[PDB]
Design a protein around this ligand. Structure first.
Ligand code: NA
Ligand code: NA
Ligand SMILES: [Zn+2]
Ligand SMILES: [Zn+2]
Lengths: 446, 446
């Protein structure tokens, strides 16, 4: 499938360190080793986890077109990878060259990939980088060539997609053009919540040409939903139709192809998490602290960029006038793997999740923003535009300045927070993939 | 129908003058006369055109609960109305009172309405105002009571809807609540252009609960349209389905009721103009100078508030990088009857319309914003929110400050222009209704 391609994902931080080591300035090849976890869902994703730099002095020969792999650094990589059968990717630079593997590279790989597989029974591979930072990679199974990596990607402040070469033109597209659609057609988007905002995110993702669209929601269409959920009908409400099934069918009719994957479940489930982990981008549109935390942990664990959107209309009672709107607000948060998280930004806290679960049990035992499509659309359009701006930069300022966006329609103000202003906690789950218990939550354990 | 109610429409300027005369501060009743044109479409609309203030000194008696109508001012009103059979509305104030017609008012009307009809064979009526400016009115046919006016309205910087009293609660609703839906259910919206922006405007108007939705467009769904037009399907494109018929059917399914009126024609037609003139609000979403001028003239002629929206993505070729986005922009203009127009704001000019028509003929004889739903949604959501903000004020600043809105997503700036900063030309077509040739354009003549 156009939505079954494999992935090698590096964090921005690891990629920056790698590029700096591979291009010291003397124009000679240099070497490094990436040790990766894997997620083997509908597509294979290699998740860069550890980096070993091969010192220049340790390489018996370094020239502008060759580097000798010191055997003991292969062994050091085997020693890191052995316990969890991690994938080992050997990387070298092509200063003054091109992103093409040479005959020497092929013949070297034939030797080194057999050594790596004898050390660790796992998929391994090799990669090359040019000075710009762009990479190509390929994988070897049982120590013998299997396949190129379709996509090497880094979701930084800007999102970088480096595609395996084809005979067709593959220039980076400009925002809002048809090359944009070409990129999106090879990507998978996950919509968490087919909500007031999420149905609008999903509509845009569909019409922008994304190749696979996961829809995650356990809720149903109701009469109260009809003022907000795109594509929903009165008939849908009268049969309490699941939101994900309604929207999957809409996408099928819009696109002429069954490219949506409806998951009728809460995001707090093994089913939803394992499906979402396959995606190339997460859009979190569920207005609970729990859901935002799950999305946060998926994004870190599986190295997926995350866009989180919320809106609010707080009200108060005025002594003289009665109930009044207090404010009308929206928030868009972009989270890059290894950058500050939703937790760091206090979008949720342990206490807020605790109180929210208690209140849900109180509401269960016992058993103001009613018409808000305009606000939902104002926020959801900004949310998807943020993804476009990071894939195909078009703003007059660096994308890092817009890491958080807050707007008020009552105060007619919009403010931006730069990534560098956000304190970061230690991120223990980065690139751990599906290590059990899933996301560190025993409730999701196997 | 809930969409067949009649209307008495005053301009903000006339209403302000009327209220000032009716409430000089001595707490005694005062009197004035409104002379109105009419539009008799699917609903009767009285369009306030001229105002005669009855001087306090000319009234034989003025008390806190009575005023004597001087007969010669009825004759002056007859003399103004005679040529074009205009409707005459007698207005007096209720200082310290309520918006209820008294027995004295009923008995007075029985006399004066017969005199008015003997003078001018037309519908006439009477109205009352309290100090706040709120009004009630009723109409007399052949000089005898016929019916109350369902809605007296002034579209100023704020939009005022004064509804005929019912046994049910009728408090002014707060933005984004259910009372909002109650107001909208009695209104007619006209969507000019079921375009990238117009289909999103129409979707919001539908789900917000508007009672009647006119859709005006001659264009069809095509494959190139599927990345932008809400509710459109591949099947729609394969049969080149008219946009208005596609969207009318969507609205029927969404709302469970056939409340849309699809007009498969250009706005530059007698059919479209006469349909639009029935509306309570115009949304202009067609990106031609001609269409914006027609909408401008409809709004002035029939006293309809107008929201005009456009977006642009100018591009340029960079010597070093190739084609680049120059800017990514949107514009929302609110036009109130008697306020500055789209012409005043140079949204179109005679020269721009002339050149546009020549280029269309050049293109005819001979025979960059391709994927832009996110921008269309960002602009269309702001456009409908602007209507909400003026009907149910919720901003921390006066609505007049936001008469024009300009935003750039590339420069990350949004600017507002106040009505008071815009120069106004003489507005010769204000409240002339369907005087021929329609809109002053011989091409639309009968
Ligand atoms: Na970090
Ligand atoms: Na004027
Ligand atoms: Zn090489
Ligand atoms: Zn009275």
């Amino acid at each position: 499938n156009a939505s079954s391609g494999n992935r090698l994902i590096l964090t921005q931080e690891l990629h920056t360190m790698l590029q700096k080591h591979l291009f010291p300035g003397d124009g000679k090849e240099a070497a490094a080793i990436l040790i990766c976890n894997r997620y083997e869902g509908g597509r294979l994703k290699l998740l860069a986890k550890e980096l070993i730099l091969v010192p220049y002095e340790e390489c018996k020969s370094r020239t502008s077109d060759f580097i000798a792999w010191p055997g003991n650094y292969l062994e050091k990589a085997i020693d890191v990878a052995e316990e969890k059968s991690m994938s080992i990717i050997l990387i070298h630079s092509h200063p003054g060259g091109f992103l093409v593997f040479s005959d020497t590279d092929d013949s070297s790989d034939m030797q080194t990939m057999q050594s790596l597989f004898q050390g660790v029974d796992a998929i391994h591979g090799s990669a090359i980088m040019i000075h710009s930072g762009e990479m190509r990679a390929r994988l070897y199974r049982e120590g013998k060539f299997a396949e190129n990596v379709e996509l090497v990607t880094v979701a930084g402040d800007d999102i970088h997609y480096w595609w395996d070469d084809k005979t067709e033109q593959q220039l980076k597209p400009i925002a809002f053009t048809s090359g944009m659609t070409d990129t999106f057609q090879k990507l998978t988007a996950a919509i968490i919540g087919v909500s007031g905002t999420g149905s609008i995110v999903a509509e845009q993702v569909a019409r922008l040409g994304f190749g696979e669209i996961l829809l995650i929601d356990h809720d149903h269409i109701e009469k109260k939903n009809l003022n907000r959920i795109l594509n929903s009908t009165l008939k849908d409400a009268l049969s309490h139709r699941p939101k994900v099934d309604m929207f999957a069918e809409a996408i099928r009719c819009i696109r002429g192809e069954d490219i949506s994957r409806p998951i009728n479940n809460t995001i707090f489930s093994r089913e939803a998490v394992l499906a979402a982990a396959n995606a190339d981008v997460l859009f979190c549109c569920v207005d609970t602290y729990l859901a935002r935390m799950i999305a946060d942990r998926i994004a870190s664990s599986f190295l997926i960029p995350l866009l989180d959107v919320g809106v609010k209309i707080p009200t108060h009672v005025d002594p003289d006038d009665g109930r009044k709107i207090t404010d009308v607000t929206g928030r868009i948060d972009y989270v890059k793997p290894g950058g500050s998280t939703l937790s760091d930004r206090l979008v949720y806290t342990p206490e807020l999740i605790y109180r929210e679960n208690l209140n849900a049990e109180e509401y269960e035992e016992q058993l103001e923003a009613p018409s808000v499509i305009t606000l939902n659309m104002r926020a959801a359009s900004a949310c998807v535009s943020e993804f476009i701006a990071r894939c195909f930069p078009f703003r007059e300022y660096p994308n890092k300045r817009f890491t958080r966006t807050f707007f008020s329609l009552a105060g007619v103000e919009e403010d931006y927070i730069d990534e560098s202003s956000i304190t970061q906690a230690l991120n223990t789950r980065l690139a751990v993939g599906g290590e059990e218990p899933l996301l560190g939550l025993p409730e999701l354990g196997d």
